[PDB]
Design a protein around this ligand. Structure first.
Ligand code: HEC
Ligand code: HEC
Ligand code: HEC
Ligand code: HEC
Ligand code: HEC
Ligand code: HEC
Lengths: 110, 110, 110, 110, 110, 110
């Protein structure tokens, strides 16, 4: 069983997002796929279904829903959570940092 | 059979290209590969042969020639046309926009 | 357009199947997957959906229905029809042999 | 709660193994790789390390140990447990049959 | 620089072939592809070109010619020679055994 | 004999790097993965191990050390050196340019 995350701060999460995700992921409504998929409205989505994106077999078949609890374990270590993913991200060790990024992703709605 | 496209406008095509392709594709002569291949001189080329580019099995084996009529069907829905492609683009569903992009691609020569 | 096939003979089809497919494909009801999927009840099926089978991206995404006319084109040259397939079969180039195999596949029902 | 893994019968297990697995997997000491890896001494192994076998990225990176409890969940639905696997097996859907196969696997030691 | 192999014995090589390759590879003229390609007339062939076979990217692109010197190093350890191959064979440590198998492959002509 | 690797100019190397590599590869300490991995401290590394990067099977299994002499051969033609790589780079075909880039890479240390 995992610890719950501390409350996330979306402004800190945006800063972390720009530093750690933005070169592969756009975050704006209608933004383009690139190395990775656009992430607007990611939170709560069924995995492997962003419009236009061609996923690995692992991510296509992964069958999770991206709620914050699932994002927490995934973002800690993507390879461990989803072996076979083509997302080239080692992970974020710090619980507050993961909480902040998740809180930022949560604002990508409207 | 396929409905013909309307006449394309290259300037609108360029605008559409920069909004919808430019983050994966360069368009200048001798431009680099990135997410996707450089597209200078694309139109009329045998598929899966751009200098330097490491294609999916599907795109390497595809055996088409990118004439305008073929580009029409492909750009409407890449996954339907070339299942197994790693091009993360859903397609352009509006005939005029598809025609405009094709008209732009046609200018990439000299 | 496609030249029609001659009428197939299922008994010749079975002989051809055992010589050219049987080492990758079972044909009995509830037969197992191996190199390739079990083919009982193949004809008329949506492509890439046989119980249990782990397909290539190309075959998973292919979106055809294996009607006889589609099987004709596919079995003549699988790589041309479905570039990116992992089916290691060059094709049957003789119309009568292709028709016979199709006639055999059509018997796999009940 | 997940159903407790029932006591397995190894003789029934072998019967189930030969009907559902043997076309891809050998079970004898020093038996060959084929579609899937030789499974002698599988129980207790780190995943994705059987001598000579070229795994999918998902199975190579899976990082589990094949204890009986892990096999229970995996064998029920391989695709759910290991999305991205190339193992073409839908799963042992009946819990007693699944337990019997595990009991058979457990005997492959010496 | 490698040692030359000792003279190979084709009868011993056939025995080794049946024990170590035959479940993935046929050896007869006109024999079928299976897990791996038919190997009749393999010796001296450009790599990645057997009729009908769908290779990994690595083997498709490998650009070697299968002369006995190249078969020697490859068969010792396929992964080391061709990283990314999907051939699930660890290798043969013993120079006489590799020589024998190569001498057997050399007879697959006529 | 293979041409000796000429003395490289690192400033010319950086210029060549920014024109030919930077769209896929960062070069700064702690820079992000993108299309390809961050290359800080690349020289002398075991291949296929840069933190966070999800490699092709060929690059993951490559088993080389990126000394300058190995980089020379690789960078001349990546596809020839590492068949199966997903690096979309045809190669540095001019030996002085190839040496300059290596000299630049050598400076990425501290
Ligand atoms: C490029 C080097 C990336 C970095 C850095 C990050 N991500 Fe990523 N991501 C990337 C790819 C190529 C993919 C698809 C993976 C596949 O196996 O197909 C992803 C996927 C995600 C997902 C899942 C999307 C879905 O299921 O629809 C999420 C939620 C995601 N990525 C988020 C994410 C975050 C929060 C990152 C840093 C803080 C991050 N990614 C880094 C490519 C890259
Ligand atoms: C990144 C998310 C991409 C976007 C958006 C678009 N393209 Fe693309 N394209 C991309 C990749 C990775 C590839 C290779 C695909 C593979 O399976 O190997 C491609 C391929 C093409 C091709 C074919 C090139 C060839 O056969 O040589 C064409 C003609 C092409 N792409 C054009 C194109 C256009 C016109 C786009 C939007 C208007 C577009 N692409 C989007 C990556 C991405
Ligand atoms: C092994 C060397 C094979 C031989 C010979 C043949 N088939 Fe095959 N087939 C094989 C594989 C591995 C797959 C999956 C391909 C993938 O890319 O995922 C297939 C697929 C088919 C299909 C499609 C099934 C579906 O969409 O559900 C059909 C209809 C099919 N194969 C039929 C077929 C016939 C009639 C053959 C010879 C007469 C034949 N196959 C040869 C493996 C191999
Ligand atoms: C062919 C159609 C298969 C059938 C039926 C079964 N297995 Fe399998 N298995 C197969 C492949 C190709 C692989 C490698 C998968 C990959 O993604 O690389 C596997 C893998 C396993 C493993 C894991 C081995 C390891 O981690 O070292 C186990 C434990 C395993 N298979 C067992 C198993 C059992 C018990 C089956 C039926 C009762 C079964 N497999 C079916 C190919 C096929
Ligand atoms: C299944 C478990 C295999 C065993 C055992 C052996 N081989 Fe194999 N081989 C296999 C596959 C799936 C492939 C294609 C690999 C790819 O990456 O695409 C191969 C390939 C070869 C080749 C190269 C063929 C070519 O380039 O055209 C050769 C020469 C070869 N295999 C020979 C060989 C020998 C001599 C073996 C044991 C003594 C052997 N293989 C074992 C599958 C399997
Ligand atoms: C994108 C179009 C690229 C260009 C241009 C270049 N590289 Fe690259 N590189 C890229 C990818 C996607 C990968 C991973 C390849 C895989 O098969 O997994 C690489 C890999 C390298 C490596 C090896 C890294 C390692 O083993 O850890 C090196 C040393 C490397 N690339 C260097 C390099 C140089 C010097 C380039 C131009 C001068 C260059 N790359 C171009 C993507 C792309």
């Amino acid at each position: 069983a995992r610890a719950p995350l501390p409350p996330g701060d979306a402004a800190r999460g945006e800063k972390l997002f720009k530093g750690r995700a933005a070169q592969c992921h756009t975050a704006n409504q209608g933004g383009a796929n690139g190395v990775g998929p656009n992430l607007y409205g990611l939170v709560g989505r069924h995995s492997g279904t962003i419009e236009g994106y061609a996923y690995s077999k692992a991510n296509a078949e992964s069958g999770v829903v991206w709620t914050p609890d699932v994002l927490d374990v995934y973002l800690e270590n993507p390879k461990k959570f989803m072996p076979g993913t083509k997302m080239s991200f080692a992970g974020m060790k710090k619980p507050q940092e993961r909480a902040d990024v998740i809180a930022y992703l949560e604002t990508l709605k409207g």
